[PDB]
Design a protein around this ligand. Structure first.
Ligand SMILES: Nc1ncnc2c1ncn2[C@@H]1O[C@H](COP(=O)(O)OP(=O)(O)OP(=O)(O)O)[C@@H](O)[C@H]1O
Lengths: 79, 79
């Protein structure tokens, strides 16, 4: 007996499959109301010249280098 | 003995003659996100030709007419 089953309390994050046009409306909504879609992040996180749409944090590369060498992460910050 | 004092559980409305400029972002924020200011409501009231910025119900006219004849109002609607 063997079965893959279903995962109930966790959801697998599937990356987007298309490019969405980004208007100033989306920038204003993201920077004011906090509204965003995962396609926005997938579009601006594929390249790295897009400094007119998201603040590129330097901790991302260090965190990725740390996780790729078998080490867990614990992020803590303010409000 | 006489003293006007201060009113502590109610606030007094003050209109906004200063005509604030209106942009498309204010249209989007009001229609979608619910955020709006008092200057907006004062601006969309004085002139009745501003139909591309707010939906003008016909109930406000009847409520004003009912309150001008010393009748109190009760308004009930839904979510
Ligand atoms: N006359 C109008 N023109 C344009 N938009 C309107 C108008 N009336 C209401 N809306 C929109 O409908 C939404 C709900 O409006 P409002 O907050 O008045 O409902 P409500 O009855 O107060 O809701 P609740 O009953 O939960 O308090 C708001 O986002 C608002 O922008």
């Amino acid at each position: 007996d063997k079965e893959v089953g279903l995962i109930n309390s966790l959801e697998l994050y599937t990356p987007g499959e298309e490019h969405d046009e980004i208007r100033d409306n989306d920038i204003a909504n993201f920077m004011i109301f906090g509204k965003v879609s995962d396609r926005y992040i997938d579009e601006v996180t594929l390249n790295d010249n897009m400094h007119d749409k998201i603040i590129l944090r330097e901790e991302v590369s260090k965190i990725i280098e740390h996780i790729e060498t078998d080490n867990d992460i614990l992020i803590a910050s303010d409000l």
